Write a protein that binds this ligand. Structure first.
Ligand SMILES: [Mg+2]
Ligand SMILES: [Mg+2]
Ligand SMILES: [Mg+2]
Ligand SMILES: [Mg+2]
Ligand SMILES: [Mg+2]
Ligand SMILES: [Mg+2]
Ligand SMILES: [Mg+2]
Ligand SMILES: [Mg+2]
Ligand SMILES: [Mg+2]
Ligand SMILES: [Mg+2]
Ligand SMILES: [Mg+2]
Ligand SMILES: [Mg+2]
Ligand SMILES: [Mg+2]
Ligand SMILES: [Mg+2]
Ligand SMILES: [Zn+2]
Lengths: 230, 97, 204, 121, 98, 129
RNA sequence: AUAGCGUAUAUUAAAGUUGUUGCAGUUAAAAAGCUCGUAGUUGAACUUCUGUUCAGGUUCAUUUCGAUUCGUCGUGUGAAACU
RNA sequence: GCAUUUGCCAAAGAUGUUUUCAUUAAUCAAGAACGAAAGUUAGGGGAUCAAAGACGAUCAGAUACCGUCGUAGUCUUAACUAUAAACUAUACCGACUCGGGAUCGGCUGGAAUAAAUGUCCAGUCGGCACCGUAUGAGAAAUCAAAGUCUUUGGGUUCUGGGGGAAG
């Protein structure tokens, strides 16, 4: 049953090779409702040579307990980070009874939570976005990560925890300033991820002008959306 | 004071351009017209309205005008007044017989 | 006094006591209101009503497919009208009183839907609906009275969403106009479907 | 403790839903129908469904039936008897305005057109 | 942490409010805080009035027996226990005059 | 009481762009407040602006484009040798791309950057980006 | 880790855990019970603005010109600001 | 901390100002004025309640929670004592920013009666307080400020730096 049965109008448009450009999906803010929606863009042909190589990674797996009438009910929560060291990142955590299930669950929770990590230059705009255009900050309950631009080579000056999330973003060089509580690894990753996400959120001047008016990919493919469903 | 307003939309919006005058920003995001904020990659509550163009006879023309309204402004119950004004701007809200 | 088209629109609008609203002014609705009644009643400016109905129409016109517009209502009053409106406009709507929380968020509802434009009769009554509209990037048009969460609503049609006389007629006027723009009718020409149909009937 | 399992209720509901016309006000006759109409394993359970389904029959002899839909049968014949008008209760010709209304109209400038105002002592 | 906004009392401007003795324990309680419910009590029970009306005497202005006037002041401590005000749930704690 | 109205006016304004105000009324205004303003204006942060003549000390109204991210002052306006610059550029500014640290000089008031051109600078005044 | 490697003690960083930058202060430590008040610290707004023209570079832009090559110069405009 | 009437004595806010004066100001070590109770010294006064005490009862134990009494105090004059969960446990001055009615004081327009030191409608300064809500803050409880702080800087005073030993 490895058959993709779209359940959204997006899962639809995508499965049928339309709008094939992940970022085109973000531009329009098309809520990533399905998990395959991402599986589509990243081909499992494994030509072991391109960075676009989607990377699924687990980080934390913890036992969570609820006390109950002569019973300690134990379950597990896990955090998976998804990413192409090319400019997209997704954090996902899931809780479940049997561990393996949490993992495969978080693998997916991580996909729907995909975010565009805008890169940039510090100074001479040579050839490749090594850092972030500006400094950004990650908040999580009580966690504080600060992402700061850097020189080339001075690559990722963060904890083993954020560092991991950063690489999966494609960020090559950045200083990090962390504030308050880190053992709370869940909150830590969430902060790095949130920070990295707030990259696009930051309205800089080198944007400023006026957007290129376009049409919602729905009002464009309207006709289609009624073919296979009929 | 139209002043500042006309001038910000003035030229085209183009992200991080390098010495080699190349665009790099993976994609150029939609910008809220009444506020000039950036519409997220996952901005749930932000919407793009599609309004249609009419042709001096009560008929409708295969032409639409779009209005991007960010999340917050839509949340403060602005939209109705926000839109009703982006339409004054693009000469349209006042609908003459 | 534009052509008679406008003349009559206001005659009927004026007819259905649409300008008469509750004694509660949501500051948000400040502009859309007109003369504050002595008796305590609040009166809406009609130009806004008419004026807005036009936008409402023009935005529904924007839609490529007709079923991508969703008409929602809870009240028994607009229940009648909305159903007819949905009929003549060829757009989706449901009779079930309850909204069924998840209809727009959750893709497993029996009534799941993903409209491109939303029309609610009351920002109060269908507050649940608008609440979800907020999650799917779908804009809303609604009949708003002097008191109503003008939040998360893009197109306002200030009127008396109380008496069906009012409600239904606004729905009618919208469709009659929707028809015109679409090309299902001619600008001038008269609609041969009395506003009466949309009236909430209470058989024995 | 004579209450009905959900299944018992669903059955009676859906049976009545499909065969309303045929269903009688007599349990025995109906029980026979219910049995000839579907798969009721337990002979006993069959009755329960009919005994209760029969109950609903007498509650529809009233009309207010939450949970049940009698489309073609009733619900629709309902529309066929309620759509004959003659003159829109709204007279586009002559219309009336009161103090307030006219007050708003005189501001709008539409104060007076083809609609007459009436004073009261 | 904090449980109430008014902590049970209504002292909103001044720094100190008169103390009053509890109708039931006699305990001293700040006026504003303590519970109150000045009630209009009736002299005799239901069916018992009719018995005093027939054997009544003086004129009959239809004004019956004078009703008793009880100005009630309970301190929390016993007010509760005395079925007056039952420990209410979370959000119902802000409800006034149910 | 009041102090460094440049700060009074400045935050009142930030609070503006941050709240999404369409325009702002700054109450206590001075030459400084205005110069800073035309410097932000000149660099393209704020829109057209009008100074009303309060017969006491003018009131200004600034139109809000929507590009101001933050614009504040700096507590005591320390002195800053040209050598003290990178310290503050890496300190106050969100990048090596929005250089706007307004300073006071003897050569008037210049952009964080212009001060390197004129080659002098001096005391810090405020920042905007 | 490796001709090096443990250990003890003082000391630097991690210490935004002594904090000008850069902390905290309802409940976690922490606003004094409250007022007056010289030292100290901190203080509203105005005083040639501005315009025209010339010039030297500077930059940046370029439906553009002359040179050179593996990346610069000269020329013209506009513009800004400097002077 | 302050609630019986009335009369004096000096004082205060807010509102109202087309009145003057024109930086006179914000906060503050020193340094002072206050500061329920309880308590202290020397006199008054002594009704009620009542620490200690004397008794009953209750208990396995009760010099404790109930009950009967009772001294100091509680009241006052004049001295002295300064602490209290002296609590909003949230320093003062200043500017901003959401919605909404209801309040207390002053003022300005208006309407009805009536011509009332009244009532209502509408403004509006200033004062307790509440309701709703935040793509603002937080560890959270919660906060319209506990907000405008990693996009880290209006002015100033005081305080803290694992716990117990310890104020
Ligand atoms: Mg740390
Ligand atoms: Mg006290
Ligand atoms: Mg070692
Ligand atoms: Mg009295
Ligand atoms: Mg003393
Ligand atoms: Mg004595
Ligand atoms: Mg015994
Ligand atoms: Mg006694
Ligand atoms: Mg008056
Ligand atoms: Mg009033
Ligand atoms: Mg904090
Ligand atoms: Mg939060
Ligand atoms: Mg609140
Ligand atoms: Mg700080
Ligand atoms: Zn008691």
């Amino acid at each position: 049953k490895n058959d993709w049965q779209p359940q959204t109008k997006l899962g639809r448009l995508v499965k049928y090779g339309k709008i094939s450009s992940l970022d085109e999906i973000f531009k329009y803010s098309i809520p990533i409702k399905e998990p395959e929606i991402i599986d589509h863009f990243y081909p499992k042909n494994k030509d072991v040579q391109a960075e676009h190589k989607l990377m699924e990674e687990v980080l934390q797996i913890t036992p969570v307990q609820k006390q109950t009438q002569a019973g300690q009910r134990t379950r597990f929560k896990g955090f998976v980070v998804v990413g192409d060291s090319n400019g997209h990142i997704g954090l996902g955590w899931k809780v479940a009874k049997e561990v393996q299930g949490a993992i495969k669950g978080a693998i997916t929770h991580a996909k729907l939570n995909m975010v565009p990590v805008r890169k940039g230059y510090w100074g001479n705009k040579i050839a490749n976005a090594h850092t972030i255009p500006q400094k950004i900050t990650g908040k999580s309950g009580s966690v504080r990560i600060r992402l700061v631009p850097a020189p080339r080579g001075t690559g990722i000056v963060a904890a083993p925890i954020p560092k991991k999330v950063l690489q999966f973003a494609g960020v090559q060089d950045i200083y990090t300033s962390s504030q308050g509580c880190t053992r709370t690894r869940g909150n830590f990753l969430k902060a790095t991820y949130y920070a990295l996400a707030n990259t696009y959120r930051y309205l800089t001047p080198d944007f400023w002008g006026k957007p290129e008016d376009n049409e919602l990919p729905f009002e464009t493919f309207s006709e289609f959306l009624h073919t296979k469903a009929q | 004071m139209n002043s500042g307003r006309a001038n910000q939309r003035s030229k085209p919006m183009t992200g991080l351009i390098n010495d080699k005058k190349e665009k790099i920003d993976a994609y150029l995001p939609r910008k809220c017209d009444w506020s000039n904020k950036l519409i997220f990659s996952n901005d749930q509550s932000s919407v793009q309205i599609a309004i249609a163009e009419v042709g001096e006879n009560g008929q409708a023309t295969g032409s639409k005008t779009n209005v991007v309204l960010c999340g917050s402004v839509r949340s403060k119950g602005e939209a109705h007044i926000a839109l009703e004004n982006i339409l004054r701007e693009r000469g349209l809200y006042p609908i003459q017989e | 006094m534009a052509t008679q088209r406008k003349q009559d629109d206001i005659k009927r609008l004026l007819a259905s006591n649409c300008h008469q609203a509750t004694i509660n002014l949501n500051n948000q609705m400040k502009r859309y209101i007109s003369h504050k009644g002595v008796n305590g009643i609040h009166y809406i400016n009609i130009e806004e009503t008419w004026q807005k109905i036009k936008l409402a129409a023009r935005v529904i016109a924007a839609v490529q497919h007709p079923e991508d517009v969703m008409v929602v209502c809870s009240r028994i009053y607009g229940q009648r009208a909305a159903i007819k409106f949905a009929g003549y406009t060829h757009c989706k709507s449901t009779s079930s009183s309850r909204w069924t929380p998840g209809t727009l968020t959750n893709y497993q509802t029996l009534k799941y839907e993903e409209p491109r434009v939303l029309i609610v009769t009351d920002p109060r009554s269908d507050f649940q609906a608008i609440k979800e509209a907020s999650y799917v990037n779908i804009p809303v048009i609604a009949l708003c009275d002097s008191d109503s969460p003008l939040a998360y609503v893009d197109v306002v049609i200030p009127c008396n969403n109380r008496s069906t006389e009012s409600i239904s007629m606004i729905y009618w006027m919208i469709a009659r106009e929707v028809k015109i723009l679409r090309g299902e009718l001619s600008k001038d020409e008269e609609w041969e479907v009395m506003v009466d149909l949309f009236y909430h009937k209470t058989l024995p | 403790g004579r209450v009905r399992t959900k299944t018992v209720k669903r059955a009676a509901k859906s049976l009545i839903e499909h065969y309303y016309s045929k269903l009688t006000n007599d349990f025995h006759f109906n029980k026979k129908i219910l049995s000839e109409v579907a798969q009721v394993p337990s002979k006993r359970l069959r009755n329960k469904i009919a005994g209760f389904a029969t109950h609903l029959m007498k509650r529809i002899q009233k009309g207010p039936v939450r949970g049940i839909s009698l489309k073609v049968q009733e619900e629709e014949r309902e529309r066929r008897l309620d759509y004959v008008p003659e003159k829109s209760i709204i007279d586009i010709e002559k219309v009336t305005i009161d103090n307030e209304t006219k007050e708003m109209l005189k501001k709008l400038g539409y104060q007076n057109i083809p609609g007459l105002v009436s004073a009261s002592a | 942490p904090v449980k109430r906004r008014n902590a049970g009392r209504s002292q909103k401007n001044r720094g100190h409010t008169r103390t009053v003795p509890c109708t039931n324990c006699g305990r001293q309680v700040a006026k504003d805080k303590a519970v109150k419910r000045y009630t209009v009590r009736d002299m005799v029970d239901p069916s018992s009035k009719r018995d005093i009306q027939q054997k009544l005497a003086f004129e009959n202005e239809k004004q019956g027996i004078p009703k008793l006037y009880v100005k009630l002041q309970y301190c929390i401590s016993c007010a509760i226990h005395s079925r007056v005000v039952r420990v209410r749930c979370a959000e119902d704690r802000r409800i006034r005059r149910p | 009481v009041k102090v460094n109205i440049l700060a009074e006016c400045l935050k009142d304004l930030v609070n503006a762009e941050k709240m999404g105000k369409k325009q702002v009324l700054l109450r206590p205004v001075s030459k400084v407040v205005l110069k800073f303003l035309r410097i932000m204006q000149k660099n393209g942060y704020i829109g057209e602006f009008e100074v009303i003549d309060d017969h006491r000390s003018k009131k200004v109204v600034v139109e809000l484009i929507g590009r101001i991210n933050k614009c504040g002052v700096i507590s005591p306006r320390y002195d800053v040798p040209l050598a003290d610059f990178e310290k503050w550029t890496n300190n106050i500014l969100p990048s090596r791309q929005f250089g706007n640290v307004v300073l006071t000089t003897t050569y008037g008031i210049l952009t964080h950057e212009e001060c390197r051109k004129r080659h002098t600078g001096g005391k810090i005044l405020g920042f905007f980006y």
